Amino acid sequence: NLETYEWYNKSISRDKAEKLLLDTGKEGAFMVRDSRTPGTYTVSVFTKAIISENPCIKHYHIKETNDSPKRYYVAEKYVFDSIPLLIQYHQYNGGGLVTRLRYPVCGSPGIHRD
């Protein structure tokens, strides 16, 4: 039933998804494909934001809930035992985020670092 939408690419591999999206060269070119577990999908989007030798294809998970009937949401591929560990992770890896967490700020008034 997803098969009736232009963006649904069912079976295709990550690598050919990336090739197809790169070739378009259009900002916000995208495709939905299938993920490892059923009920889970993957959005893949072309972007020229982060010049780090442009461009990038971002991949997102679409998880489902345990509802009646069922709901869907965009989330990262990962869960963490701890918020600090989830933060730790995102200092070194962008993940589902635009930039990754380089610099904590404390907003207690009159406070400064080191």
Swiss-Prot record:
Disruption phenotype: Mice display decreased mature thymocytes and elicit profound defect in CD4+ and CD8+ T-cell development. Additionally, they show a strong decrease of cytokine production in response to TCR receptor stimulation. Impaired TCR-mediated calcium response in gamma-delta T-cells. Loss of Vgamma2-positive immature thymocyte-specific transcriptomic profile, although there is no change to overall transcription factor expression levels. Not required for the generation of IL17A expressing gamma-delta T-cells.
Subcellular location: Cytoplasm; Nucleus
Post-translational modifications: Ubiquitinated.
Induction conditions: Through a myriad of surface receptors including the TCR/CD3 signaling complex, coreceptors, or chemokine receptors.
Domain SH2, residue spans: 7-105
Domain of life: Eukaryota
Tissue: Is detected in the thymus, lymph node and very faintly in the spleen, but is not detected in the liver, lung, kidney, heart, brain, intestine or testis. Expressed in T-lymphocytes and mast cells. It may also be expressed in natural killer cells.
Comment, domains: The N-terminal PH domain allows ITK to be recruited to the plasma membrane by an activated PI3 kinase. This domain also contains a proline-rich region (PRR). The adjoining domain is a SH3 domain, which binds to PRR (from itself or from other proteins). Next, a SH2 domain is required for binding tyrosine-phosphorylated substrates. In the C-terminal region, the kinase domain is required for tyrosine phosphorylation.
Function per UniProt: Tyrosine kinase that plays an essential role in regulation of the adaptive immune response. Regulates the development, function and differentiation of conventional T-cells and nonconventional NKT-cells. When antigen presenting cells (APC) activate T-cell receptor (TCR), a series of phosphorylation lead to the recruitment of ITK to the cell membrane, in the vicinity of the stimulated TCR receptor, where it is phosphorylated by LCK. Phosphorylation leads to ITK autophosphorylation and full activation.
Protein family per UniProt: Belongs to the protein kinase superfamily. Tyr protein kinase family. TEC subfamily.
Self-association and partners: Homooligomerizes; this association negatively regulates kinase activity. Interacts with PPIA/CYPA; this interaction regulates TCR signal strength via a proline-directed conformational switch in ITK. Interacts with THEMIS. Interacts with FASLG. Interacts with VAV1; this interaction is important for VAV1 localization and TCR-induced actin polarization. Interacts with TBX21.
Name assigned to this protein: Tyrosine-protein kinase ITK/TSK
Gene from which this protein is expressed: Itk
Residues of the full protein shown: 239 to 344 of 625
